[model samples]
Target: MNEKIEQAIREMGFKNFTEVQSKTIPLMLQGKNVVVRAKTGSGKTAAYAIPILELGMKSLVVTPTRELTRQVASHIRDIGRYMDTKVAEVYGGMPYKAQINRVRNADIVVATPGRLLDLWSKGVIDLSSFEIVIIDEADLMFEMGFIDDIKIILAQTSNRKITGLFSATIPEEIRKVVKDFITNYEEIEACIGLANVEHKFVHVKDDWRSKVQALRENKDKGVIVFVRTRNRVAKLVRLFDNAIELRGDLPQSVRNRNIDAFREGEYDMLITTDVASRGLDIPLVEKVINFDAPQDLRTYIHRIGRTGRMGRKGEAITFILNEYWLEKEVK
Candidate 1:
């Protein structure tokens, strides 16, 4: 590991790492395969990033969404300022030739699965020198049909490469990837929640009108109302004229446009489905509402996690069967 990397870490104002960072950085530096099941907002991005910058290796990072890919790229860029390292973001929304131009001589590439495959299939990159391949948000990758692409990418890489898989939790899909391929990997699972974010549940038993009222009152700045069904999102959109709607069914371009508007306060609230719940970072999101509670507690955490990020005070209100303001962490 380079001493310059340590100086960069301190210069960036990162005093002490979260538990996940402390545990995984050393193993990653030692050239070990590490799997981290750290929750969102756990500073998990830096856990692997610092090691990659330290080793100054040609690393391939595969992320689930462009939003995440952007953040990961930003973090690495911030750290790599002192060192002579190149980073590129690979995703599908942009022009092909531009991405081709950027990634041609990159040291570390932060990419989405599809675009990376696109570039690789066209014989744009050589795998001989790529030493690390990181799969970020693996469970979501499985949901989005990128696991097969990951398989092809990993199969072509050399034996000396190190693989890092980071996710909110270990789903069956990740388990299969580990069992079949990354047998020698080290798994680091950190059950983390943003410290200042408070969790509370409100029972909207039958009258959804109550939720509308609550949302109206809780609109401090930015708010995201999470509903389980698309029909419910539509109804909310109709009822609350100021709420912007987003679901998995929306086209990628439209979704991106709406998210941009929501961030700029063009919409009073962003009413969305679970599609936007996983690792979507918008700093101004002041509150998270489970308009309908998710059956899975894991989804609930990811939902509330939309707010109170980066140590900001976050509020979560979930409409569950039995409820009160529970000021505690969710697992």
Candidate 2:
């Protein structure tokens, strides 16, 4: 690694790299393609961000959601702050002219696949100029029905020098994309949420409001409530005066504001759906409340893994509506 990039990372408050970063950063710096399957809250952003900054070339990073796009772009800027890195954040629900100007001047562009292709089609940004292309949360991109769009964008990047595909899981669909685009990539999986966190379950005999009461008892701690759908998030937001809402279909500006408020301690409770589960990073979250129980172990781990990150002590409390489902997940 370059001493300058190392200094910049240190200034970003990292005394050591997380497992994902330590494993993937070296391979990427050598200009090798990589396929990374890592859990959420494992510092996956820096794993790719550092290599982009190190390459010092025009790069295109496509993320699954606008919120993740904003978060990833912001982290890239912070890591490259001293190196004068230029990052353009492009997504829908915001003005286009500003994005057009930023893309023209950016060393890196973090965008949702939709807006990225839209800009490419309109000649606002040249996809062919991007030497590095990274797809973050590739499985989420598939779930959101953006795999075709991903293929379209990848088709245009004829100058791709280093390609990185990152996701929590690599199903058969994503593997096909890897086969088509990435060349002889290194594969690595970082440790999931198996350490430092305590998991607890409370059987709700009646309404789950009782769990909310428990949250109120510890309102000073940084907490996030995860529901199943955007409708549930809206309903819960109305129930609490201070709790913020985070879910899909929100304006990017409002999403950024709410996340910033929660991260900066202006709000302690973030009531959200699974949109915040995968890639948005908020530090010092002491607790996570699964208002709706996850259907599988993967969703369960990501929800609780938000806390207990970077070696911090965190707790996950799940409200079990039925004991039958409990055995399905626990044993």
Candidate 3:
């Protein structure tokens, strides 16, 4: 690493690399494809980010959601500021021309897969110039159906470019994509698990109305209720006091503002769909109520992850419907 970059890392108080960073950075600096499996808040961002900066090449970092894209970009810029590297962010709900201009001037572009793919298809951004490709939250991209977009974007980059994939969890679906796209990759697993987040399951035989009421009754401090549909989100928000609705239909700016508002103590509880579950970094959430059990393990992980952040204690509760006894039993 350069002197300025080393100083930047020291200023951040990152005296030694984390478990994932320690193993991945050396290989990445030497131009190796890597797949990292680590939990949220385990310093995964810096693991790949530091190596990308040390490589001294223009890079592209792809995330699954707009919130994550912005968060990752901000973190990367902080680390690379001393190097005079220009980092730009691109996602939906931002001005297209502004993003285009940013792409033209930036040495590193952090973006959501969908927006990045759209720009590439429209010939608004060129991918061939990137010397390093980093895909953060690979499992989430698979959950969002962006694997094909990832493949397409990777195909546009130079074969000699370094590739790094990082995620909190590595499921079968994500592994399949890694097998297809990345070659000779190293897997670095961090031992920080989700045991910190407490889990509870309640069996309710009553109708959906009773379940919704139960969620309202159990609410304390700030809670996030994960429902399956937009209509469910609206109904729950109306049924509960101090509740706000969050879904994908709302504009990204509105969604981001709402999240900030919640973090700033504007709302006590948030009733939301699956759109708000993944890749959200809400540190003060006290509870996460699964109004409806998630369909998959990744969703379950994301829903519970909203709580117990930054070493604070948090809880997650799931209401099991009679028809989904298998899910309850499996858990």
Write the residue-wise lDDT of candidate 2 on 105-209 in tens digits. 788999999988988888888899999999999999999999999998888999999999998877678889899988999987654564556777777665557
Residue 209, model 3, lDDT: 71
Q: For every model shown, what is its TM-score relative to the native structure?
A: 0.58, 0.59, 0.58
Residue pair clashes in candidate 1? none
Best by TM-score: 2
TM-score of 2: 0.59
Candidate 3 residue 236 C-alpha distance from true site, Å: 48
Give the per-residue lDDT digits (tens) of candidate 3, residues 1-331.
Answer: 7888889878888777777778888889878888887757888888888887777788999988889888888888888879888888999988877888888878889999888888888987788888889889888888888888888877887643788888876766777778977889876765343466667877777748769767757737677878888888877778765777787788767777777777777788777888754444455576898888887665676677677656687788888776365354335
* List of clashing residue pairs for candidate 2: none
Q: Give the distance in Å from residue 63's predicted Cα in candidate 2 to where it truly belongs.
A: 0.8
Q: Tell me the whole-model lDDT of each prediction, alpha carbons only.
A: 0.77, 0.81, 0.78
Q: Give per-model CA RMSD.
A: 10.6, 13.0, 12.1
Measured by TM-score, how close is model 3 to the native structure?
0.58
Which portions of model 2 miss their true places by more than 4 Å? Answer: 193-331
Which stretches in model 1 have alpha-carbon errors above 4 Å? 191-331
Model 1 lDDT tens row, 150-261: 7777777675367888887566666887677675989686545545567676666564777767666664556888887888888888887777888777876677788788
The 10 consecutive residues of candidate 2 with the worst lDDT sum are 275-284
